[PDB]
Each structure stands twice: as C-alpha cells, then as structure tokens.
C-alpha cells in the first residue's frame, strides 16, 4: 500500500453522489447480489434490523451449504431444517410458502429454497434498504469506484509475456497492493495493423463476463503510447508451455490432469455460451494457469457476441487446426465451433501433437482444410476409452451431431464417462485441489523483435472510449480482499 | 429495561425524517454543541475524517482540562501547548489565528482558544457534517425522540411528596430503566383552583433551562385524570427538612454546609437570571437534595419570564417572609427580589428561624410587611463575620444597593469572603464533594387529606398543549447514559 494513492481512497460527501443515484442501475439482483460491496452493505442492513435476521441467516446458511465439504453437508442440511423449516423453529421463516418449506425438508438441495429467500428479500426488505443509510453508503463507494485510477496507480515490475501489440506485465495497484497482469497495446501498432475492433471486443467481453474460468478485467485505461487492460494475474504459464516445455523428453499430460483442465475449460465455455458469446480461439496457448494450478481462458480478440435473437453467425476467424468444418465451409455457425476446438485441445494435451498433422508436418492451407473437413482422426493407445469417445464426440464434422451446448448448458456434456472422478459442484466452486501446482520460483515461459503516424481525432476518441476505467465487480472484490473496504467502512473508530 | 418498550426504540427509514429536516432548528450550536446525540454524531464525523483530527482532539483536550483536578491542570496545559500550539507540533492547528495561538501559550485559560476552535468547526467542518451520513443519523434519532412516550412508558413505584394538585412519585422509564420524579397535577383540581397558568409556566421554564442546579424536565404528558411532569429525581429531601427534622434538638447547619448550598443556589439563580427569568419563590423547602448531596432549585410555578427588552416587571407573588420590599411596595422589580430571598434562606439555614419572626411568632400580614420594609435584621453569634456581611448585603431594603446580578452574572457576588474556601470552577462543574451525603436507606421527608366538573374543549386543548412530550436534551442524555444510544447506533454488529 503506497500511501499517496491509498490516501485518495476516501468516501465523498453525499451531495457528490446525486448524479450516480439517477444514472446507475439500482436493481436488486445487480446491486445487492452481484456487486460484492452492495451485497455486503445489504447484509449489514439486514443484520441491524431484527425483523430480517431469520432471512439473512437462512441465506448465509444456504450459501455455506453450497460450498461445504461433502463430509459436512448432511450435518448442515439437518441444522438448516431444524433452524428454519420445522414447525415451531426459533428462526422459522414465516415468509416462505408452504410448498417451498415442504420441498426443502424432503430429500441443488435448497436451490428452490434459495430462490424463494432471494425473491422475498428483493421485495419489502430491498425497499427498506433503499430507504437506509446503507444504500447511501453504497452510492459513496460507487462514486469512489468511478474516480480516475489510471496509469499512475499501477507499478509494472516484470514482463509476463509478449503479445502482438505489446508486452504483458506483472503489476501492482499502488493503493491496495493487489497484483495484476497489465496487457499493453501499442497505439501506433494497433492503428497500423487495423487492430481496433479486436482490441475493443476483448475489452468488452472481459468486462462483462464474471467467471472463475475466464480472466477478469479490473481496469481499462490509456497512456500516451498504449491502451492497457489490467486483469487477473496468471503466474503459472500456459497449457502449451506445460505440454511441451517442462518435461521435454516426455511431453503431454497424464489423463487426470488433462481431464481436470478440460472440466475447467468447459465451465468457461459454458459461461460464454450462456451469454451468447462464441470464443473462436480455444487452444492450449490461450489457457493460462494461476499459482494454484487452476486455469482460465484468455485472449478474447476473435470472439463474437451474438445479437439479441441471433442464433448463428458467419465469418472466417480462428487458428488453423482449431477451426471447425462449418467455419471452414463458410456456413452459418454457433457455439459448436468452440467444442470442436476443445476436442483438438484435449487431443493435444494427451498426445503432444494435433489430430491432423504429425510433428514437423507442415502442409498447404488447402490440405489442412481437406483433412479437417474429411479425414478421420486416429487415436493412439495413450487415449483411454473415455478420452477417445469424448474427443470423437467433439470432433464430429457435422455440428448437429457434435457434443456441446444443449438446453442452455453443458450439463449433458458433464455426464460423460470422461468426468467420472470429477465432482462438479466443487470444480465449479473452485474447491478442488488441482493435480499440478506450479513452482513460484520457476517461470513457466519461453525465453526476436519486430521492425510512425500522427493520430487524428478519430483515433484519440477510440482510445478514449476504450479507456472506460474501472470494472465494478473486480474493483469491489479488490477493495474487500485487500482490507480497504473494512478500513473505510468504519462508523465509530 | 422492560423489553416491550425497549423494542419500540428503533431507528426509522430515512423517508420518515424528511418533515423534521424542514422543521427543526439545525444550527451549529443548537445541534452539534447543545444536544448530546448531535454532539456525539458530529464528533464521530470529525473522528472519521483525517483532516479534522487535530481540531477534534484539541476540542476534547480543552474540555478535559476544564474538568480536570487542580493537581493535573499544569500537566494538561503543558501537553496541550506541546501538541497543538508550538511551531512544528504534530497536531499543530493551522486554522487558528496567530493572536489566538499566542494568547494560548501565555499564562478560563484556553477559553479564548475554545471559542476559536468552535468558531472554526461551525464553518467548513459543520457544512461537511451536514452533507454526511452522521447528520442523517441525527435526524433518525430526532424522529425517535418525537414519538409517543406517555403514561404507559413509566412505572410509578413510591410517593416522594405531596404538592397542591397531586403527589410526586418516584418512577422508572420502562424502556431504559432510568429513575425520575413524576409530578402529577390533578386536572379537576387545577381547573377548580384556576391553576392552569402556573402549571404552564413551570413546565415551560423547566423545559427551556438546562442547569445542574435546577430540576430538569424530561417529559410532559397527560392521562385521563392528571398532567404529568417527569423530571430529575431528588431523593435526598428538601433543605427545610434537613434544617429542622434530622437533628431536631440542634436545628440549623454548620457554616460550610450552608455556604455550599448557598453557592449552588446562587449558580441556579444566575442561570435563570441570564435567561431573563425571575424565580420569585426561593425558600428552603423549594431547594431539593439529590442522593449525592448536591442541591437544585425546584417549584417554578410563580416564576416570570421577562419579555424581550423587558428589564423589570410588576405583580404580587411569592411566600410571606421571602418577598422583597419593592415587591411588597408594589413597585417595578427585576432579579433583585431573588437575592433578597437568598439572604432569608441563608439566614434560616444557619439560625433555624427567619429574620423577621421568632419561633411561634405569628403576626398580621400588615405587621410582617412593616418588619420586612422597615425593621433591621439582627444576627446572633452563630453568624461568622462573613455570613452576616453577606446576609446584610442581600437583605438591603433598596434593591439598587442590594448585592446580586451585575454585569450579566453573579461573579461579583462569588468574590465575597463568604465563599473563600469554595472553588467555583469545580462547584459549577459538579466536581466538589458535598459536605452532607443523604443515607439511601433513610427517607428525608415528613410522614391530612383535602375535601366534580365536566371538561370542555377549552380545557382539553390546554391539557393537550401542556402535554408537549419529550424534552430533547434530557432525552438524549438518558439514551446515552442508559446505553441505548450505543446499542442502536451500531453500524456493523
Ligand atoms: N492474465 C495474464 N497473466 C499472465 N500472463 C499473461 C496474461 N495474459 C497474457 N499473458 C501473457 O502474455 C501473452 C500475450 O497475451 P495475449 O492476451 O495472448 O495477447 P495477444 O492478444 O496479442 O495474443 C500470453 O501468451 C501470456 O504469455
Ligand atoms: N424532583 C423531585 N424529586 C423528589 N421529590 C420531589 C421533586 N419535586 C417535588 N418533590 C416532592 O414533592 C413535593 C411537591 O412538589 P412541588 O413541586 O413543590 O409542588 P407544588 O408546586 O404543588 O408546591 C415537594 O415538596 C417534594 O417533597
Ligand atoms: Cl439506516
Ligand atoms: Cl493438427
Ligand atoms: Cl458519511
Ligand atoms: Cl421571618
Ligand atoms: Mg495470444
Ligand atoms: Mg488476441
Ligand atoms: Mg412546593
Ligand atoms: Mg408550585
């Protein structure tokens, strides 16, 4: 915590928040459930108002049940029912309908109960929160969230990697001490190579999605020479490095490790697909490891957000060897292209080569296309029966026959025998211990450089729009995680 | 703390306080200095805003100096100067003018400094408080202050005394447990004896004055049969009882005890006279002792509040033997009549009889008048030289020659040799140990009864106006003293 910048984190007088009161989305789900500081303040409100004690405690107890160890869940289920649902219980929740109480006592246990609790809280209690000091305090935090926090607030201290338009640095937010990755995009190069649209798509997607399986955007700003995206630091290298460059004589992963990453990637794909986004660039090098060994998908510049009521799109984009037949054939396509790419990615994790080309085999584009469109993939012994079936189901040429996103989720896919030893609740909650933990002393990265133009208003306005500033949810997470929320939200110190 | 009533003490939603925001006096002195909860919230505001730390701490340190023991004041004076006034002091108070800093370092030390600190705080910092959550919290407390807290909130448990229109009871405020005296005025009797004007004057004065030397009014309400004034409980009896009825064979007080009460009564008189009120009924029976042995003046039904720009009044009122010559002569008079009554009161405390009549001597009104107007008071040996001079100065027939209120205070009077061993700072602050402490087991009171009419709108409207409800300053003191303020002013429990 550099004190100069820490000192600029101060809550404003209430008059300064009046514009925000009119401009913000202040809906229940968006404010009190999704935004961490909103949720904290709403729960503080409920905690100070006796009437709402039962409801608050039931809510917390369901959320605790949902992330409990399997060994303790039967206990927690019995304690919850005894506390809130049995006839004369001391915290009996009078607001619940009889069906919901009945459903809750029999036998995503409590997911219906949670929906009912949250539905209750979004009515009278939310209205009372809006008429409380805690709502005004939320507005003060939103004002602070919106203040300039640009290049001066970040200390770049190490190069993490090299992209097409600049380096990615390990950096520290000076006020809080939180470590991030800062991806720099050189303005002149972006302009020269007509990279504006791609840069903006990546920024917009990373800003709007919130998943433990996708790198999160916390800040977007500009300097004289660069656009900058401050995002989750992934210190563990990329899957490509780990397939080939750690144990070079024996490349590839053991099945359990490959399956674990597959399960995480699938969860990230699902999250995009539920938001009508097609990734279009899944491959080992775009999947990054954190220092715990959990992975996230990254590099979202080729992604497409389908319009409202848009079921399919068109356009040639992606990496040769990962692009699905329907894309290569120039047809309309949807999320299915990403599942094709997942099959290729799993294949490579196990085989240490791609399904269509041997090591060192370099072919004309036309030949690679004909192989992806027509050639039957072959599977060595390394592949267990479950691995082969799964790959086969994902590498199907016809997208209508391909395994993937069905009925608004990947639940169908999750039931595949490949995932027999994966506990999905704990995977999705980030509870499971990864099979590989990167060494903090080790850098999991590879050790040539490339060879002027005035900017006009059109360029500078684009850079200004790109530099949208601070993303609400990650910023609020940072403030809470680093202790600044606790420190500034004091009432009587 | 009866829980039924304690449960009704809950802070409202902010929408309920909007009327109060428009109707209340929200000036700096009235809100942030005089009202205990206002002061507490303003100081909490200052404590949470780094800029105002020096100012807040200097303020607190001056107030602590003002109530410190004489033995520790030199220390405290040196510490204050070193902390806030010396050139490069860590909490140097930049806002102070050079004169004031200079004055503060040389040689009511710090009274000029306090005025300057408070003048500073009443500008920018007060404006910032008004734009804070702490001001809104003040409004919530003011809303609660204004809610119905009538007959049902009080438990009468013992008779303390008998007045002209009803009994005075020891009572408990059910929600907080605080002990009070409740003076009841029977409605039918008040009406019959045309006692409305007197009842109202007492209520209005006790509500508006705030002195440790005058009984404080906390609540005024009505029942079907009575008007009720809830005020400071004075469990120690009255001075009349203590002069005559404790040691019956040897009545009267030792000089030091008499002098101490005189000093307290003088302080109470001064407080009324600074507020342009003439008491008109000082006598031993109207001076009550608390369980510490400190006294207060009480029984304010004969008082008169001089109008704005009114220097003198007219009207025959008071107790025979305590009424001054100018009153008896039917002339205009001011505060001087109360100093005459003080001389009579001191005389009786020492002599165990009045100055104009021997024990058992009962005379025509005309004879008593002639004695008060013309007779020279004589003083037994019991009176020390200082006691006699003081009485003489107070019993002067001509009010122009009489000792009393001069230049807006009683400071002239305080310098009299009578008060040689009285430390006035500590007296006025309630620090001094009284010379007599009443026994809690003992009742300091004497052990015949007196022998119907429909009420009209005119009566019921008067009773309604009388029943003005809760007095701000005592109610806020109660909430703080009993812990309810602490309990309800929690932010994150
Ligand atoms: N969040 C991150 N944490 C750590 N390293 C990163 C992160 N994002 C990118 N990198 C490193 O920087 C490289 C370039 O980033 P990338 O997003 O792939 O850029 P481009 O869009 O130009 O390909 C990556 O291959 C990786 O080595
Ligand atoms: N605050 C009090 N605490 C304890 N006893 C009180 C208090 N006020 C009055 N009393 C008792 O009740 C008696 C009657 O009250 P008082 O105010 O003198 O009534 P009145 O105006 O009718 O003379 C007093 O003489 C005293 O004994
Ligand atoms: Cl509130
Ligand atoms: Cl390939
Ligand atoms: Cl505030
Ligand atoms: Cl007399
Ligand atoms: Mg890349
Ligand atoms: Mg890219
Ligand atoms: Mg009386
Ligand atoms: Mg009276």
DSSP string, A217-253: EEEEEE-SSEEEEEE---TT-BHHHHHHTSSSSS-S-
What token pair was written down for B179? 């002990």
Concerning whether B292 is annotated as a catalytic residue, the answer is no
Q: How far is the CA of B287 from the centre of ligand 9 (A)?
A: 10
Q: How was this structure determined?
A: X-ray
CA A150, chain centre distance (Å): 23
Question: Which ranges in B181-252 belong to alpha helices (H)?
Answer: 187-192, 196-208, 239-244
Number of C-beta neighbours around residue A483 at 10 A:
12
Per-residue burial over B8-32, b = 16 or more CB atoms within 10 Å of its CB, e = otherwise: ebebbebeebeebeeebebebeebb
Between the CA of residue B174 and those of B161, B168, B180, B222, B457, what are the distances in Å?
22, 18, 11, 17, 32
With both helix axes pointing from N to C terminus, report the angle between B133-145 and A133-145 in degrees, rounded to the nearest 10: 170
A484 to chain B nearest CA, in Å?
14
Angle among Cα A14, A19, A21 to the nearest 5 degrees reads 75
Angle, alpha carbons B90-B96-B98 (nearest 5°): 100
Cβ of B303 below 6 Å from ligand 2: no
Q: Residue B121 in contact with residue B59, Cβ under 8 Å?
A: yes
Strand, coil or helix: what is A35? coil
The CA-atom distances, in angstroms, between B17 and each of A15, A42, A55, A252, B59 are 18, 21, 27, 68, 30
C-alpha distances (whole Å) from A64 to each of A68, A77, A471, B341 are 6, 10, 27, 75
Would the CB atoms of B132 and A48 count as touching at under 8 Å? no
Closest CA to A235 of A180, A291, A171: A291
Which strands sit side by side in the sheet containing B179-186, from one edge to the other? B154-162, B167-173, B179-186, B226-231, B217-222, B469-470
Taking CA B214 as the corner, what is the angle to CA B211 and CA B217, rounded to the nearest 5 degrees? 90
Where is B305: in which H helix or E strand?
strand B304-305
Q: Rounded to an integer, what distance in angstroms lies between the CA atom of residue B228 and that of residue B230?
A: 6
Rounded to 5°, the CA angle A273-A274-A275 comes to 85
Backbone φ, ψ for residue B319 (5° rounding): -110, 130
From the list B281, B290, B334, B338, the catalytic residue is B281
Interchain contact, B133 vs A131, CB within 8 Å: no
Strands B154-162, B179-186: pairing is: unpaired
CB contact under 8 Å between B132 and A13, yes or no, is: yes
Residue A14 near residue A136 (C-beta atoms within 8 A): yes
Tokens of B472: 């701000």
- Is A448 annotated to bind ligand? no
The Cα A395–Cα A41 span in angstroms is 48
Please tell me the residue having the least CA distance from ligand 2 atom 25: B161
The answer to whether A175 and A153 are in contact (CB under 8 A) is yes
**Is position A160 annotated in a ligand binding site?**
yes
CB A321 within 8 A of CB A310: no
In Å, what is the CA distance from B123 to each residue of A73, A224, B22? 59, 43, 20
Phi then psi dihedrals of residue A414, to 5 deg: -60, -25
Distance of CA B26 to the CA centre of its chain: 23
Which residue from B minimizes the CA distance to A11? B49
Q: How many residues does chain B have?
A: 493
How close, in Å, is residue B493 to chain A by CA atoms? 7
**How many angstroms separate the first and last alpha carbons of chain B?**
21
Write out the DSSP string of A73-117.
HHHHHHHHHHHHTSTT-TT--TTS-HHHHHHHH---TTHHHHHHH
Tokens of B275: 């507020």
- Residues paired with A313 in a beta bridge: A333
CA dihedral A475, A479, A480, A486 (to 10 degrees): -150
Q: Which of B165, B168, B185, B202 to mutate to test the pocket of ligand 2 (most atoms within 8 A of CB)?
A: B168
User: Is the CB of residue A351 less than 8 Å from the CB of residue A251?
Assistant: no
Cα B203 to middle of ligand 2, angstroms: 13
Which residue among A48, A132, A137 sits closest to B490, beta carbon to beta carbon? A48
Q: Which two tokens stand for residue B479?
A: 């909430």
Q: Are B324 and B333 in contact, with CB atoms under 8 Å apart? A: yes
- As for ligand 1, residues whose beta carbon falls within 6 Å of it are A 160-165, 168, 181, 183, 215, 231-234, 238, 288, 298-299, 301
State the DSSP string of B4-55.
HHHTT--PPPGGGGHHHHHHS---HIIIIISSHHHHHHHHHHHHH-GGGHHH
Cα Rg of chain B, angstroms? 25
Distances (CA, A) of A350 to A261, A341, A420: 11, 15, 18
Shortest distance between the Cα of B1 and any Cα of chain A, in A, equals 18
CB-CB contact of A253 with A246 (8 Å)? no
For chain A, the residues whose C-beta falls within 8 A of a C-beta of chain B are 13-15, 44, 47-48, 128, 131-133, 136-137, 489-493
CA distance B369 to B375: 10
What tokens were used for A22?
């009119």
B377 Cβ contact partners less than 8 Å away, ≥ 6 residues apart:
B347, B355, B356, B391, B392, B395
Number of neighbouring beta carbons within 10 Å of residue A332: 12
Contact (CB, 8 A) for B296 and B214: yes
Nearest-angstrom CA–CA distance, B63 and B47: 16
Measured distance CA(B339)–CA(B282) in Å, rounded: 9
Q: How far is CA A36 from the centre of its chain?
A: 16
3 state SS of B466: helix
Q: Report the atom number in ligand 2 closest to the C-alpha of B165.
A: 22
Is B160 annotated to bind a ligand? Reply is yes
Residues 6 or more apart from B125 whose CB is under 8 A from it? B46, B52, B55
- For residues A264 and A213, the answer to whether their CB atoms sit within 8 Å is yes
Question: Could you give all domains of chain A from N- to C-terminal order, each with its CATH number?
Answer: 1-146+440-493 (1.10.167.10), 147-237 (3.30.200.20), 238-439 (1.10.510.10)
**Triad A467, A472, A477: Cα angle to 5°:** 125
Q: In whole angstroms, give the CA distance from residue B401 to residue B221.
A: 44
**Gap between the Cα atoms of B350 and B239, Å rounded:** 12
Nearest to A397 by CA among A433, A420, A422, A370: A370
Residue A145, classed as helix, strand or coil, is: helix
Alpha carbons B298 and B163: distance in angstroms, whole number = 12
Q: Please name the residue ranges forming H helices in A305-456.
A: 325-328, 336-351, 365-374, 385-394, 411-414, 424-428
- End-to-end CA gap in chain A: 21
Q: What share of chain B is helix, strand, coil (3-state, %, to 5)?
A: 45, 10, 40
Nearest to B133 among A47, A128, A133 (CB): A133
User: Of A148, A141, A150, whose CA–CA distance to A20 is shortest?
Assistant: A141
| Residues from chain B contacting residue A489 (CB–CB below 8 Å) | 492
Between CA A229 and CA A207 the distance in angstroms is: 10
Neighbours of A257 (CB within 10 A): 17
Whole-number Cα distances in Å, B277 to B204, B315, B376: 11, 14, 29
CA angle B45–B46–B49, rounded 5-degree value: 90
Please work out whether the CB of residue B85 comes within 6 Å of at least one atom of ligand 2.
no
Please tell me the distance in Å from A44's CA to the nearest CA on chain B. 6
Closest Cα in chain B to A138: B133
Distances (CA, A) of B63 to A349, B39, B57, B110: 74, 13, 10, 10
Q: In A256-352, where do the E strands start and end?
A: 277-278, 287-289, 295-297, 304-305
Which atom, in ligand 1's list, is nearest to the CA of A301? 21
Dist CA A342 CA A391 (whole Å):
8
Say if the Cβ atoms of A489 and B489 lie within 8 Å: no
CB-closest option in A13, A133, A490 to B137? A133
> A435: helix, coil or strand?
coil
- Chain A: residue nearest B133 by CA? A133
Query: What is the distance in angstroms between the Cα of A84 and the nearest Cα belonging to chain B?
Result: 22
The resolution of the experimental structure, rounded to one decimal in Å, is 1.8
- Within 13 Å, how many C-alpha atoms sit on residue B437's CB side? 6
Residue B310 in tokens: 């009114």
Helix axes A133-145, A36-48, angle to 10 degrees: 160
- B228 CA to centre of own chain: 19
The Cα B179–Cα B199 span in angstroms is 23
Residues of B at the A interface (Cβ-Cβ below 8 Å)?
13-15, 44, 47-48, 128, 131-133, 136-137, 489-493
Tokens of residue A219, six digits: 């800040």
Long-range CB pairs of B187-196, under 8 A, 24+ apart, other chains included: B187/B222, B187/B225, B187/B226, B187/B227, B187/B455, B187/B459, B187/B463, B188/B225, B188/B452, B188/B453, B189/B165, B190/B165, B190/B227, B191/B453, B191/B455, B191/B459, B192/B453, B193/B164, B193/B165, B195/B164, B195/B165, B196/B462
Q: CB-based contacts of A74: which residues, under 8 Å, 6+ apart?
A: none
Atom 24 of ligand 2 has which residue's CA nearest to it?
Answer: B161
Cα distances (angstroms) measured from residue A327 to each of A171, A317, A322, A338, B353: 38, 8, 10, 11, 117
CA distance readout (Å), B223 to A29, B253, B312, B332? 50, 41, 37, 39
Alpha-carbon gap, residue A486 to A471, rounded angstroms: 20
Ligand 2: centre distance to CA B202 (Å):
12
When CB atoms are compared, the residue of A131, A489, A491 closest to B14 is A131
C-alpha of B275 from chain center: 12
* Catalytic residue of the set A226, A281, A290, A334: A281
Q: What is the secondary structure of B319-331 as a DSSP string?
A: -TTTS-HHHHTT-
Distance CA(A330)–CA(A307), nearest Å, equals: 19
In contact, B223 and B263? CB cutoff 8 Å? no
How far is residue B439's CA from residue A172's CA, in Å, rounded to a whole number? Answer: 70
Q: Which residue has the tokens 């799964």?
A: A390
b/e code B395-420 from CB counts within 10 Å (16+ = b) = bbbebeebbbbeeeebeebbebebbe
Query: Whole-angstrom Cα distance, residue B447 to residue B438?
Result: 18
Residue in A30, A35, A144 with CA at minimum distance from that of residue A469: A144
Please tell me the distance from the alpha carbon of residue A24 to that of residue A32, in angstroms, as a whole number: 13
Burial label, B461 (beta-carbon count in 10 A; 0-12, 13-18, 19+): exposed
Residue partners of B289: CB distance under 8 A and separation at least 6: B234, B235, B236, B237, B238, B239, B242, B295, B436, B438, B444
**Distance (Å) from CA B243 to ligand 9 centroid:** 17
**B43 contacts on A by Cβ (under 8 Å):** none
Is-contact B395 B345, C-beta < 8 A?
Answer: no
Strands A154-162 and A167-173: antiparallel
Q: How far apart are CA B473 and CA B36, in angstroms?
A: 7
Residue whose structure tokens are 């080309």 = A357
User: Residue B77 is inside which H or E element, if any?
Assistant: helix B73-84
Tokens of A354: 């791609």
Answer whether B136 sits within 8 Å of A133, measured CB to CB.
Answer: yes
């Amino acid at each position: 915590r550099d004190r100069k910048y820490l000192a600029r984190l101060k809550l404003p007088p209430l008059s300064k928040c009046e514009a925000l009161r009119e401009s913000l989305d202040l809906g229940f789900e968006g404010m009190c459930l999704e935004q961490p500081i909103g949720k904290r303040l709403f729960q503080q409100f409920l905690r100070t108002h006796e009437q709402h004690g039962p409801a608050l405690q039931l809510w917390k107890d369901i959320e605790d049940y949902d992330t409990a160890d399997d060994a303790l869940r039967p206990q927690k289920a019995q304690a919850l029912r005894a506390a809130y649902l049995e006839p004369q219980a001391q915290l009996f929740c009078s607001f619940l309908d009889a069906e919901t109480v009945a459903r809750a006592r029999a036998g995503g246990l409590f997911q219906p109960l949670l929906r009912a609790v949250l539905a209750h809280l979004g009515q009278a209690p939310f209205q009372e929160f809006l008429d409380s000091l805690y709502f005004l305090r939320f507005l003060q935090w939103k004002w602070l969230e919106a203040q300039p926090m640009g290049e001066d607030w970040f200390l770049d201290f190490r190069v993490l990697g090299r992209g097409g338009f600049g380096e990615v640095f390990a950096c520290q937010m000076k006020a809080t001490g939180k470590l991030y990755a800062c991806k720099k995009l050189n303005k002149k190069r972006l302009k020269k190579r007509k990279g504006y649209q791609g840069a903006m798509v990546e920024k917009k997607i990373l800003a709007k999605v919130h998943s433990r399986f996708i790198v999160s955007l916390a800040y977007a700003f500009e300097t004289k020479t660069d656009l900058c995206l401050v995002m989750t630091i992934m210190n563990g290298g990329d899957i490509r490095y780990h397939i080939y460059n750690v144990d070079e004589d024996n490349p590839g992963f053991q099945e359990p490790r490959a399956i674990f990453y597959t399960a995480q990637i699938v969860s990230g794909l699902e999250h995009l697909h539920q938001r009508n986004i097609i990734y279009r660039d899944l491959k080992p090098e775009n999947v990054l490891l954190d220092d715990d060994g959990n992975v996230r998908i990254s590099d979202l510049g080729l992604a497409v957000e389908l319009k409202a009521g848009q079921t399919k799109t068109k356009g040639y984009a992606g990496t040769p060897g990962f692009m699905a037949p329907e894309l290569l054939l120039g047809e309309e396509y949807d999320f299915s292209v990403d599942y094709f790419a997942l099959g290729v990615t799993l294949y490579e994790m196990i085989a240490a080569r791609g399904p269509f080309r041997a090591r060192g085999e370099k072919v004309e584009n036309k030949e690679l296309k004909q192989r992806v469109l027509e050639q039957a993939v072959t599977y060595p012994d390394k592949f267990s029966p479950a691995s082969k079936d799964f790959c086969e189901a994902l590498l199907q040429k016809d997208p209508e026959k391909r395994l993937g996103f069905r009925d608004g989720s990947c639940d169908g896919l999750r039931t595949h025998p490949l995932f027999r030893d994966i506990s999905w609740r704990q995977l999705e909650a980030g509870m499971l211990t990864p099979p590989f933990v990167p060494d903090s002393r080790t850098v999991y990265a590879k050790n040539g450089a490339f060879s002027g133009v005035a900017f006009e208003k059109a360029d500078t306005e684009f850079f200004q729009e790109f530099a949208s500033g601070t993303c609400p949810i990650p910023w609020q997470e940072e403030m809470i995680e680093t202790g600044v929320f606790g420190d500034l939200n004091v009432w009587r110190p």
